[PDB]
């Protein structure tokens, strides 16, 4: 009623930036670690040449 | 009263637990199946014994399903934001640990099946290494369960 | 939800709302929420509404042994950089028995066609200190969830709400840009270090 | 493309977010929130001035050292078979280091321009102080990047000149003109920085 | 309240359920078709048997279609935000799990088809591995249904 | 009542339905063109018979056109924000689904026509795989119609 | 009355139409020109016929020009934000659909002229594949007209 | 009563109209210059005939200059935000259209001169393709003039 | 009073503590498993000794699990923001330290196993190197214990 | 009077005018200079003639310096925001146009000097191409002067 | 007074002091372990003497641990933002310095041990270079101690 | 008076002055160590002479250390934003200059350490290039001292 504003907390800048940048760091860490594992040298190159 | 957008993080916990576990299982199955396909052309009779890595990869998808269903059945409209965060944390802790376990299972299974083609004695060690790779997803499940039931 | 204070001049001119409105004189904190919102006998005499200047003169009779008056003084004007009439709460002015104490209000501004909301428009450092005084003063004030609109008001409704709580602030901007420069330098250094290599062979 | 995938992904994600955010602000009538005025005004002038000084010297050194190793690798490699290279082709190194000298000179000159305010309301800070901040930042970027490119260019040309000298001693004195022409760019950057900060006074 | 934009998340759930499942199926069909074409040059009689991976890749897209239709029928103008988040969660759970299942099916089908060109005994092993891969999409579907009808 | 920015999502739904579907069809036609041209050097008689992948790529652009015209006709000034989201979802569901179907049709067309150049028995298998790749865009169209009409 | 940023989306509509259609036509022309330059060495008499891909690439730029001029003529100081969104949608549709059409025409024309250097009968198939790749730009134009004149 | 920040968009209109046309012309001159030199090491008498692509690339920069001068003359401090948007649109539609035309002219000119050394008959075909590429910058100019002289 | 969003950092502390330790253990197990498999082709006798790297990698996952359990057990809804940050710090300190330790374990385990096949003397040094690479996980665990129990 | 921050864009106009023109001049000089040096050992008598591309590259830096000096001289602390934008526009329209001219000059100088070392008659053609490439910097200068002196 | 979120920077200081030190030490151990494995095949007697690089890679982790423990023991609840920043600065100055020292130790250890396999006299030089690479972590420790105990 | 967060920029000055100098010195030490390891196997007696570039990299690290210690001792609680940003300026001034100088020392030291083995006369030339590469870090230190003592 009265079209009262949504009650944003004054700390919105700090909480927003903490969440945004912590999550960006964590996401980048996961993506980079998973990329390294995904493109890990499969190690069976000592076997490949028979299979190819 | 609790905020209206609270259920979002719980729903993301459920969907993440399922999605990332499915990605881990998909990668594990893909690499293990490629290994089995390369192994077969030379050693046909090992094909069935060499499906075990695919099964251990599927365990990870089952773990993701367990956590996703648990969170989904725990969701509510008035879910407190704290519970929403717990569910998101559990969902990621199982989903991404299962993704890592799927990577481990896929790589170990591919290399181990190819090797067992050439030297049967490897099979036991391959199973042990796959167990060590899958217990990572198991630990992710444990953390997800502790968070969620808390 | 108690209703807003609505200074009316042929129509609702100044709307003012606060979830918890408290004041203190020599640290004698007192609560004015009930004395302000929903009371049909509230003394707003002395309030004024130009077409470009507004003054909400709340008054309370027995408080602290004197009839205290709080004048929330706002203005609105055309800022040529944009075509918008922007309004700012220039100040707050507390009349005690025989004296006046002024608080400047630092960050209350927004398009005149919108209301302004802000958690804790208060003189306490613990609560944002949007009110401020350069000279030490006896008064303290806190307006939890302070919302106000003095211009382009429509009936009993606040217009859409601008507010202080933003995605970024000056300090965070300075920090983010300094950190971005440092991250460029570190990424350059890390690119060079990672691209190091070692010989795969040695001479005889 | 390993690290360049990370770089490109960050760049593309950032600019997709910027396009979406700009569209959203514009469309929702929330353009009044995107106060570039408020940003440039509240972000302290000291930030701009000290970034200007720091970059003025650091990018000039990133230019000088870059050119120095570009040309030093060739000097040494060609000197393995033609040791006469070492003494003569040092002029390229001198020209690369003159860039860092421009850098320090302009960094000191710019830092001489910074003064404290004791004022924090933008109206009190004033046009003069805000202009001082932005102009010192501009001088820093100008000198630093002009010197970075100039040092890299002179390093490339010096490497070419050293390799050419490896095979014909008479060649150096004629290829040196290209290094001189490259070096002039740093002087141009210095001139522009001086003019940018010609009428600056914080206070 | 139930904000005016609330249906956005449900619409994105439907769009995700269809788009990501379709991409999973498209990859599981592209890789499988390339494998079938590469194999058929020498084993023309194996084409019909080796089309199975394409069928399971299509099954992934059918899971996506089921969940997308379910969400699009559950949408409403006054859809409460909690329900809208549930539908977005279902959409992602089916869509990206189907995408992972499609990658698994594509890789497994390609490798196994090129193998069964050279060793016919690999066919039933391929079938088992492909069923394991497609069960990932099925798990995604299960979680999607639970979320959507929650 | 309705926010005046409501039609942005309608126009973006239309533009997505056309743009992404056309990109999918363009990739399909490009890969099929390279495949057809490469085959035709040695097997000219197959040039016309081998146009089918291009046709099944163009069908995807036709789905995109149908959905885009639907949205463009169903897009008034005071479009409810919920209905505008519905149209955005329909546009994405058809467009990106057509993109997936177009990638699959292109890769399968290239592989299948190159194989057909060598092994005539592969034509029917290629057509089956193309039909499976095409039904993905068809699912996208169905979901888009459900959302648009909803 | 109507917002002042309304015209921005209209001018982006016009500029997007022209720019993206011109980029599609430029890519098509460049690829076709490289193809013609490679082919003409052995078979000089095909240079004139082999310019058809260039013509059908230019027609995409003509589509973009037509839509851009329609939007430019429709721009006026007070256009409603809805009309501006319509023009943006038309611009994106025509421009990016023509970009896809240009990509397809470029690859098809390059491969087709290179093949036609060797097997003259490939020309008719190349023309048909070019027509299929070109009607994508026509679909973009149709959607753009429906949006822009609405 | 207009914003003081209105002229930013017109300034960027002129800036784009010049910068992007200059980049397109620089690429068209650079690729064509490498081609002309690599051709001239063997057939010097073709230098002046083969300079055509460089000139047609330069005409793109002239288009950009004409539009940028027009926009610059049109700028004022009180320019309405609508006119500023018109000028940004004109600037982009000439600059990026010229960029596309410059890429096309560059690739076509390089390949065409290189071939024309080997096959004298290719000269007229190259010139026709370059005219088609130039007409893209011309269309950009036409749209830019329409917008900038509304 | 403590903010409702405080628990987000704690749940991310737990999820990170488990996820990154799991990724490190997965890399360590995977690379050491490929090394063991390659070694086993010639020297089957060494599988049960060479398994040790995998045990070292798994101990990192156990460290991650222990820290995650401490955090999850210490979580509450009213968790003061200070304790929430402490738990995020513990989670990162053990998760990424275990990530680095697992990467080192994987690399040194693979290299040491392959070398030990060639030169049995390398085994003791491999044990020492694995211990030095693994105590990094223990240091991370110590820091995480301090921060989490603080 | 004028805003506090207005001079920022003029400062950046000067900084761009010099930084980007320095980039173009540096690239032109470096590319043409490595070409010249590599050439000289084969043809020592051509160096003084081959210097011409270096001078043309330097002229780009001269254009940048001229525009930057104009901006820095006109830019007072409280210039109107409109003039500030004009000066930013001039700065970009000289800097990036001179960057494009510098790239063209570098590529053309390298290729043309290397060719002239092999074929003297390419010298005049190289001069013409260099003129066409350097005139882009002159166009940038014209636009920059118009904007900055308006 | 001492804002509620102040502890975040101090906790991240501890987390950095441990994580980046651990990553430096892990890289050093990994690279030096690969070098030692390669060296040990031909020169077994050198393995135990050559573990010095691994020891110096480990010591970086002890530096990180000391700074992390000091920060963790210097964290009260209402820590001033000044001290929280000091502890973040100490954490970075030790963690990233240790990361650089770890890269140096890894590269130098690999090269030095694989060389000392060839030339025994290189051992003392390798020790000196490792000391110079090591004291970078010590300088980081010094700065971190000053900042963290300030 | 001064803002609560003013100390952050000076703290970042100190941490950067140490971290970037450490990274430059680490790169220099690593490159020079690779050079020395390669050089030693053929010419053992030059190791102690050739260790000089490592000494100069250590000197770069010491420049960083001096600036970092100065800033750390200068960091008081009520540090004005002006002093804090002066110290940030000094931190970058020493850190990035030391980074670049360390890179140059590393590359020239590698090249010269190798060269001295084949041509001993190059020793003084290498040293003379290196002192020029190090006075750059000295320049950065000079500016950092001036800034941080202003």
Curated annotation (Swiss-Prot), chain A:
Domain of life: Eukaryota
Boundaries of the shown chain within the full protein: 292 to 343 of 350
Species of the source: Rattus norvegicus
Parts of the chain that traverse the membrane: 12-32
Stretches of the chain found on the membrane's Cytoplasmic side: 33-52
Protein name: Renin receptor cytoplasmic fragment
From Swiss-Prot, chains B, E, F, G, H, I, J, K, L:
This protein's record includes keyword Transport: yes
Record GO terms (molecular function): proton-transporting ATPase activity, rotational mechanism; ubiquitin protein ligase binding
Topology class, membrane: Multi-pass membrane protein
Primary localisation category: membrane
Record GO biological process: negative regulation of autophagic cell death; positive regulation of ERK1 and ERK2 cascade; positive regulation of Wnt signaling pathway; synaptic vesicle lumen acidification
Pfam family, one: ATP-synt_C
Residue ranges, Lumenal side: 72-87, 148-150
Site positions per UniProt: Essential for proton translocation: 134
Annotated TM spans: 6-28, 51-71, 88-109, 127-147
A GO-annotated cellular component: vacuolar proton-transporting V-type ATPase, V0 domain
InterPro entries: ATPase_proteolipid_c-like_dom (IPR002379), ATPase_proteolipid_csu (IPR000245), ATPase_proteolipid_su_C_euk (IPR011555), F/V-ATP_Csub_sf (IPR035921)
Compartment(s) where it occurs, according to its Swiss-Prot or TrEMBL record: Cytoplasmic vesicle, Clathrin-coated vesicle membrane; Cytoplasmic vesicle, Secretory vesicle, Synaptic vesicle membrane
Post-translational modification: Ubiquitinated by RNF182, leading to its degradation via the ubiquitin-proteasome pathway.
Record topological domains on the Cytoplasmic side: 29-50, 110-126
Keyword set includes Membrane: yes
Keywords: Cytoplasmic vesicle, Hydrogen ion transport, Ion transport, Membrane, Synapse, Transmembrane, Transmembrane helix, Transport, Ubl conjugation
NCBIfam families: V_ATP_synt_C
Sequence similarity: Belongs to the V-ATPase proteolipid subunit family.
Protein name (Swiss-Prot/TrEMBL): V-type proton ATPase 16 kDa proteolipid subunit c
Source organism (scientific name): Rattus norvegicus
Encoding gene per record: Atp6v0c
From Swiss-Prot, chain C:
Domain of life: Eukaryota
Membrane-traversing stretches: 166-186
Subcellular location as annotated: Endoplasmic reticulum membrane; Endoplasmic reticulum-Golgi intermediate compartment membrane; Cytoplasmic vesicle, Secretory vesicle, Synaptic vesicle membrane; Cytoplasmic vesicle, Clathrin-coated vesicle membrane
Tissue specificity statement from the Swiss-Prot or TrEMBL entry: Expressed in brain (at protein level).
Major localization listed first in the record, in broad terms: endoplasmic reticulum
GO CC entries: clathrin-coated vesicle membrane; endoplasmic reticulum membrane; endoplasmic reticulum-Golgi intermediate compartment membrane; endosome membrane; membrane; proton-transporting V-type ATPase complex; synaptic vesicle membrane
Cytoplasmic side of membrane: 187-204
Keywords: Cytoplasmic vesicle, Endoplasmic reticulum, Glycoprotein, Hydrogen ion transport, Ion transport, Membrane, Signal, Synapse, Transmembrane, Transmembrane helix, Transport
Sugar-modified residues: 8, 20, 43, 50, 97, 104, 152
Post-translational modification: N-glycosylated.
GO molecular function terms listed in the Swiss-Prot or TrEMBL record: ATPase activator activity; small GTPase binding; transporter activator activity
A GO BP entry: osteoclast development
Assembly information from the UniProt record: Accessory component of the multisubunit proton-transporting vacuolar (V)-ATPase protein pump. Interacts (via N-terminus) with ATP6AP2 (via N-terminus). Interacts with RNASEK. Interacts with TMEM106B (via C-terminus).
Function: Accessory subunit of the proton-transporting vacuolar (V)-ATPase protein pump, which is required for luminal acidification of secretory vesicles. Guides the V-type ATPase into specialized subcellular compartments, such as neuroendocrine regulated secretory vesicles or the ruffled border of the osteoclast, thereby regulating its activity. Involved in membrane trafficking and Ca(2+)-dependent membrane fusion. May play a role in the assembly of the V-type ATPase complex.
UniProt record similarity statement: Belongs to the vacuolar ATPase subunit S1 family.
Name assigned to this protein: V-type proton ATPase subunit S1
Chain's gene name: Atp6ap1
Residue span relative to the full protein: 248 to 451 of 463
